[PDB]
Amino acid sequence: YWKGERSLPNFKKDMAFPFGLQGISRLVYDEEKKAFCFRLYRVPFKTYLGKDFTDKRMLLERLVKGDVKLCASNIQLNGGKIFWLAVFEIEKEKHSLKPEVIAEASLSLEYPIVVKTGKNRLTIGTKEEFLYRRLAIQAARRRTQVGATYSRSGKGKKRKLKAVDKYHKTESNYVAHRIHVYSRKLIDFCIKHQAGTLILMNQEDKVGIAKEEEFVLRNWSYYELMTKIKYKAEKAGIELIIG
Amino acid sequence: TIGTKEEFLYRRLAIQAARRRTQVGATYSRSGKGKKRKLKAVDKYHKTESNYVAHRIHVYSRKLIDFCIKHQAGTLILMNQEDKVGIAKEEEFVLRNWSYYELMTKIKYKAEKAGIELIIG
Amino acid sequence: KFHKKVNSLEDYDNYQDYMVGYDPVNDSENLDEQESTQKSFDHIKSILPLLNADKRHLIELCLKYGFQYKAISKVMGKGIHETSREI
RNA sequence: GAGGGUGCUUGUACACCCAUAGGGUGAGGUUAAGAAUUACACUCACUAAGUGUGAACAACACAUACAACUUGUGGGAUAUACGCU
């Protein structure tokens, strides 16, 4: 404020006005009319959650039971439909390995490593993402070779082709780091969603759609990909067996 | 007829798609050195498509004014512009891919400069 | 029965003079319609690169195997429902 | 090969080069591990680019075609990619 780096934040006619916990009373759940009911400022209040299949119902259920603490929340009157912006302070439960959930790891065609667990899914990268640096490196290697073949010779073949060899060499380090970060994100999901068992499909088939497209990351052994998820697996603890 | 759908809308959307491409590809780029270096490639597309749109709008407005002056058209009328503004307002593609306020303001100032009186209806 | 339900063109005298005829205008119109369809498909192909990469590959696969939601879903990772929704 | 540097600004293309620049790194905070070490879409920052003269990473001179060239400041709004549930 004093240095003048930021102006005075003002308010508008549509700012959600705040309110604390003392305003809300009787924070319980109602099943007969299907609405978590309460009483704000001498006025009873029932929520029209609509077709809410998201985590809002679960969050409300923990909130009324006292499992989740509530902070100073806000009320908005956006477009007639009254809305409640509730801020919840939730204790971070200690996530530990629970070997009873199955994690489904698959290779794909434009959506590299695909991981499915329960109602959750995550993709590790994307096809053009993995191919951008590869295409750049290959094209640059082509033009470097063309320039070197047309450059001044007689100063040594090593001085002529060290960059030519290094440009092909760095592709290997690129793909190695790529497999590294991919397995890192796979293990990150495995730890994050408390998954205990992870299994990687062969998912190879024959003819059909496959046998014409070569699969991003190819088979489950490209650049020791399998190994780089095995050695990493028990590095974190999750159980990656076989599929 | 000034302007083509390919040279105005398609190139604008191609720049937008390239920006989304770089945005997607920046997630797994060099990491651990901060957000700024990750979004470095995004930073290239700072005012790319805005500049392209401004240049094409300038060219189109200049050709319109040149045609009007060369035929001594002392009054230029925009046909059904109010209704097109109305439909554009209750849409998404038309507002965010068809700069009509910029075209209208360029036409207004480049016709008030040349004496042509501009009408909207 | 089918072969006995078929007459002989010789039963009509000088049938080669006034029957079994065609107009080249129809052929030219058919080829023009084919060219119109080809131009529309070329327009669509030119629009394709402007789309997101995943949605472009979905269409490209759907144009070389053909709206095979099942085999595409196993290829992709998304389910039948998700893959159909993305298509 | 994208993308770029110099050729007043913008667009297209153009000569000359740089370009794994969606990369090569440096420091600070934080985290994890017995350690090596890893990590951060945490923060900040550096590094490539016409020819000649010129000791020079000094400076100066020279360097393609067409079209356009009223912007700047702010507010409201929408969407994209990422992170959490």
Side-chain angles (χ1 to χ4, degrees):
Chain A
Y1 256 63
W2 179 90
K3 293 173 170 171
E5 302 183 339
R6 163 166 143 172
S7 78
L8 187 90
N10 71 321
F11 302 104
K12 218 175 305 290
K13 184 54 61 54
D14 54 7
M15 61 103 180
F17 62 92
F19 81 111
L21 305 311
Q22 322 88 356
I24 282 192
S25 49
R26 319 178 205 177
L27 197 54
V28 279
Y29 161 70
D30 156 44
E31 39 154 313
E32 308 163 356
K33 325 161 194 183
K34 177 33 40 53
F36 304 82
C37 179
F38 64 105
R39 219 212 186 207
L40 181 69
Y41 289 114
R42 295 177 181 197
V43 183
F45 274 127
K46 44 168 194 203
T47 89
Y48 180 36
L49 225 63
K51 297 255 178 170
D52 224 335
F53 304 94
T54 75
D55 293 288
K56 289 190 202 154
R57 175 160 202 215
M58 166 212 64
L59 282 154
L60 284 179
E61 276 159 9
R62 334 176 42 82
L63 176 63
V64 278
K65 281 162 198 169
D67 300 338
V68 165
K69 195 208 149 186
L70 185 69
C71 324
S73 301
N74 283 284
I75 318 283
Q76 185 186 48
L77 289 66
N78 186 20
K81 331 184 134 187
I82 321 164
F83 290 114
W84 174 30
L85 317 170
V87 152
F88 327 91
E89 203 157 13
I90 321 183
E91 183 39 66
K92 286 174 192 183
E93 172 259 9
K94 274 241 166 175
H95 294 280
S96 42
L97 251 170
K98 302 185 157 163
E100 46 89 14
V101 198
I102 170 65
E104 212 98 48
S106 318
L107 293 168
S108 192
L109 275 305
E110 56 96 22
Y111 228 91
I113 285 197
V114 199
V115 155
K116 195 179 60 276
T117 306
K119 314 149 305 320
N120 331 307
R121 212 278 337 271
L122 151 65
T123 322
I124 308 330
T126 303
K127 186 177 89 291
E128 60 304 5
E129 194 286 3
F130 175 81
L131 260 204
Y132 190 106
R133 270 268 284 283
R134 276 217 75 153
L135 286 186
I137 289 204
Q138 290 152 354
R141 182 182 158 194
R142 299 186 243 128
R143 28 172 294 268
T144 299
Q145 276 164 330
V146 166
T149 49
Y150 284 117
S151 80
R152 312 171 237 146
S153 52
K155 306 198 189 188
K157 199 160 190 184
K158 200 84 216 85
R159 193 237 155 202
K160 191 186 184 163
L161 301 179
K162 85 281 183 180
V164 160
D165 307 320
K166 184 231 75 204
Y167 259 80
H168 146 77
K169 221 82 75 155
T170 166
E171 204 104 66
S172 325
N173 325 61
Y174 169 39
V175 78
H177 149 93
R178 264 329 181 181
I179 297 330
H180 177 108
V181 55
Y182 293 159
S183 45
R184 188 55 217 183
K185 302 287 307 293
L186 169 43
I187 268 64
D188 284 345
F189 195 125
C190 285
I191 284 46
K192 155 63 190 43
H193 281 84
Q194 307 184 122
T197 303
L198 158 78
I199 286 188
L200 19 76
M201 297 59 278
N202 159 54
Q203 194 254 326
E204 222 278 350
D205 211 69
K206 47 185 169 180
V207 201
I209 280 196
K211 247 186 45 63
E212 213 152 16
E213 296 42 60
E214 247 285 357
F215 267 85
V216 47
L217 268 44
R218 333 293 261 267
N219 56 61
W220 272 96
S221 59
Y222 202 49
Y223 279 95
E224 286 71 325
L225 200 146
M226 183 63 76
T227 323
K228 262 175 261 166
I229 326 180
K230 155 187 212 148
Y231 173 78
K232 182 179 298 243
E234 93 306 331
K235 179 225 64 64
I238 44 92
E239 174 35 276
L240 181 271
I241 328 176
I242 199 45
Chain B
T1 41
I2 330 172
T4 88
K5 163 186 214 167
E6 153 278 307
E7 250 163 351
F8 194 60
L9 174 66
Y10 284 17
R11 291 289 298 81
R12 164 207 269 279
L13 285 163
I15 296 153
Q16 291 183 183
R19 184 174 139 74
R20 176 176 181 291
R21 193 185 38 41
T22 275
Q23 271 192 298
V24 168
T27 320
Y28 279 53
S29 306
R30 182 118 171 185
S31 42
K33 300 299 240 261
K35 195 152 58 176
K36 280 219 164 37
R37 203 208 160 170
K38 263 221 187 299
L39 279 195
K40 186 196 44 153
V42 165
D43 289 313
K44 295 197 332 311
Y45 298 106
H46 176 5
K47 282 270 273 314
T48 308
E49 71 264 22
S50 210
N51 283 341
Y52 193 98
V53 158
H55 168 76
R56 314 299 308 181
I57 273 180
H58 272 325
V59 164
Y60 299 164
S61 209
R62 209 53 220 162
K63 309 254 280 303
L64 168 63
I65 293 312
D66 287 343
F67 183 90
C68 289
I69 290 175
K70 163 260 280 203
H71 292 304
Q72 319 182 344
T75 315
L76 171 74
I77 283 179
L78 303 174
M79 326 264 306
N80 318 325
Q81 196 59 23
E82 250 203 77
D83 303 318
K84 302 207 251 203
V85 170
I87 168 181
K89 248 160 203 186
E90 305 335 325
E91 293 281 282
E92 157 217 352
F93 211 67
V94 187
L95 259 204
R96 249 289 289 131
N97 283 285
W98 169 50
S99 281
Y100 76 90
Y101 196 81
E102 304 164 15
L103 222 33
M104 257 177 24
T105 196
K106 300 299 165 200
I107 283 157
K108 195 173 307 197
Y109 96 79
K110 287 156 155 228
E112 194 201 309
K113 189 168 149 189
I116 321 174
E117 287 227 359
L118 178 68
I119 311 179
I120 308 103
Chain C
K1 282 177 153 178
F2 164 74
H3 194 63
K4 205 130 221 165
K5 230 155 269 168
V6 168
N7 327 251
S8 172
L9 280 166
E10 261 69 64
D11 279 312
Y12 318 97
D13 188 67
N14 259 327
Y15 82 96
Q16 265 169 164
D17 249 20
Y18 75 109
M19 280 188 12
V20 197
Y22 87 111
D23 200 342
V25 176
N26 299 353
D27 304 345
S28 53
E29 278 172 346
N30 158 53
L31 287 203
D32 291 351
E33 188 199 15
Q34 269 188 354
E35 270 329 286
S36 179
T37 315
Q38 174 94 349
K39 262 237 204 173
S40 269
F41 170 68
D42 291 0
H43 176 202
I44 294 325
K45 196 275 325 188
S46 147
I47 290 194
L48 262 186
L50 171 165
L51 263 195
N52 322 265
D54 40 19
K55 315 278 257 283
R56 183 180 188 186
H57 206 176
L58 257 59
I59 291 300
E60 196 271 335
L61 283 187
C62 262
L63 270 51
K64 205 214 64 203
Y65 301 126
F67 273 63
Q68 275 195 276
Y69 322 86
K70 169 65 72 183
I72 285 180
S73 86
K74 149 187 225 171
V75 150
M76 289 330 213
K78 336 293 262 289
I80 263 58
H81 296 357
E82 191 136 77
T83 299
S84 266
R85 227 196 53 79
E86 313 193 323
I87 300 271

